Amino acid sequence: MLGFLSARQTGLEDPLRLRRAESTRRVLGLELNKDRDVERIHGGGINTLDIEPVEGRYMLSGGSDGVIVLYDLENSSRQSYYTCKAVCSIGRDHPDVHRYSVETVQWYPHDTGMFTSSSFDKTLKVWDTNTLQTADVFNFEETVYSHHMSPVSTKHCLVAVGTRGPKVQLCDLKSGSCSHILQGHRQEILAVSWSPRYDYILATASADSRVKLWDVRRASGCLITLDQHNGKKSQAVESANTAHNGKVNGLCFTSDGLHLLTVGTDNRMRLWNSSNGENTLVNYGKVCNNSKKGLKFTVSCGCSSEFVFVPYGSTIAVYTVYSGEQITMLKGHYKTVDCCVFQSNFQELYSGSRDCNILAWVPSL
């Protein structure tokens, strides 16, 4: 590493080299945090986490008990040991608390003054973070499994919602229009994710073992349907062209948005060319998941090699996205891990699981 510092000082290597190499080294040295703790307030398992995209300071967490906790991740104390204190809380005494489990919570991109939370109580609530009051509510005829706002859209502000209905809802936060729907799936839509690269590209994964990419501006259904075999087993499109041999319960675009990682209940993760949905045949081995709802997993950013952190039983499996090589198992949870969210500023990880714990993984040394 002194070689890295010397090369940076002498201009031999771009500082990009040191930055991404050290980010990768930090991610590889991920371990149970020696001096850090997260305050425990959820009475039930944490189903979702979200660190705000700008300044990466505050973290939302939705629990199976319906409460939403807002934590400050910064060590505002002077000690090396600190607990991520809870700033705010939609608790059981809040007038607008979710009646059932909160399954997805997401900070509004471009601004930390608002966030959103969808629950199995058939509601997508939009909260003002300052007053901590519901600015809006969208009701659905069937329970919400996931939702996502575009991390890129300066123009549109649509929330793509996947419920147990076979339709992907698009709720306009600009003047409230939840009527827009996308047809083409056949069972519950367990995951939805906007492309970080393209403004109007949305990937939706449903229990019909299919993943569809939509240009929501378009009037002609999905753009691409992901196919495991890319055409080896080709059939007229009524039941073929499946992404997995089970329910596809998780989506994640890579950092650049040029590839898509789909995890399904066939104990398989697959990497897809996001421009034509071709399977890249990256192996990843066996990725154990049996979740009946959406599975939240994230990818690394700002590193020499991209990593993907997938909940794997009661562990976090870290894989290399483009080679599939298994990095490691982060092993500190006592029950199945529901979500993991990656802090890209310091290569940190926060994992929420059914054991009512949010565990922080920090690079060692």
């Binding site: 471009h110 601004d111 003054g113 600015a135 509510v137 859209s153 300066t154 600009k174 003047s175 409230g176």
Partner: protein
């Protein structure tokens, strides 16, 4: 609309009136017998289709001879008040030298109006659904080119959309329809681009009858379309029960004003604009 683009093209002024034509006493008796007969009672019980009762009352307000079935032949114009007003308007307009469009949704009452015009000495021309399509264009042309034809007979829904009837000056809609658009098209057909003289539309209604409620429904649908398409904020005109109950007869005695006039008695985002718009829409 023709509000922003009006300055580019010309448009002669258009005036419109809704005449409220009292029922004749025989017509009034027939209407009251029908609204007291057991058929409308079964309609109110839901045991029979209300639609036949609607058609029957519309027939009664058009002319009793439709529903019931010298100076006593078929379709005598003295037995329906709307035909009295058509008598007066046709006579006055012929003395004025104008040219008339005579509209009616019913082709049977269109034929009754033809027989009435033959009983008078008005020259006229008829075009309806029974005329062959290949000979529709000549008739219109013959009406539009000369003045020796006085009144042209239509139903609101015959011909292609907007058949060019320009030589007409006055237009009378003999009976209202359920669709606002067919009556709007009826009045629009005379008053189009390249209309030389001021065109006025007279809608003929029978007050306190089914026809008044048909006109009320027509205005209500027009209001709904306008609210959806041009501006949501709109002064509310109607009552839910009065608008929907349409099997009664309260003919005015001129002591109290008509129902229509009683109803119309007065005449990237920076997450704060986004939040402001959300809370604004939600407080409403």
């Amino acid at each position: 609309m023709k509000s922003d683009v009006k300055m580019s093209l010309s448009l002669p002024d258009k005036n419109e009136q809704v005449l409220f034509c009292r029922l004749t006493d025989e017509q009034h008796k027939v209407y009251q017998n029908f609204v007291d007969s057991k058929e409308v009672y079964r309609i109110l019980n839901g045991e029979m289709q209300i639609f036949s009762g609607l058609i029957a009352l519309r027939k009664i307000c058009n002319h009793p001879d439709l529903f019931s079935g010298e100076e006593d032949q078929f379709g005598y114009w003295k037995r329906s008040g709307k035909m009295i007003v058509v008598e007066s308007l046709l006579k006055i307009w012929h003395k004025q030298g104008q040219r008339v469009l005579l509209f009616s949704q019913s082709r049977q009452m269109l034929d009754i109006l033809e027989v009435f015009l033959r009983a008078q000495k008005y020259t006229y021309l008829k075009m309806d659904g029974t005329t062959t399509i290949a000979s529709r264009q000549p008739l219109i042309t013959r009406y539009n080119e000369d003045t020796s034809i006085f009144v042209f007979l239509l139903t609101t829904r015959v011909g292609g959309l907007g058949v060019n009837l320009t030589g007409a000056n006055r237009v009378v809609i003999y009976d209202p329809d359920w669709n606002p658009s067919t009556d709007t098209q009826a009045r629009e057909r005379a008053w189009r681009i390249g209309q030389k003289k001021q065109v006025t539309v007279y809608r003929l209604l029978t007050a306190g009858t089914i026809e008044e409620k048909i006109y009320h429904r027509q205005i209500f649908k027009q209001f709904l379309t306008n609210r959806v398409l041009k501006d949501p904020k709109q002064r509310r005109f109607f009552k839910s029960n009065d608008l929907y109950e349409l099997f009664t007869l309260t003919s005015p005695d001129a002591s109290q004003s008509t129902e229509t006039s009683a109803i119309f008695a007065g005449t990237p985002l920076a997450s704060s604009s986004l939040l402001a718009k959300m809370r604004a829409r939600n407080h409403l």
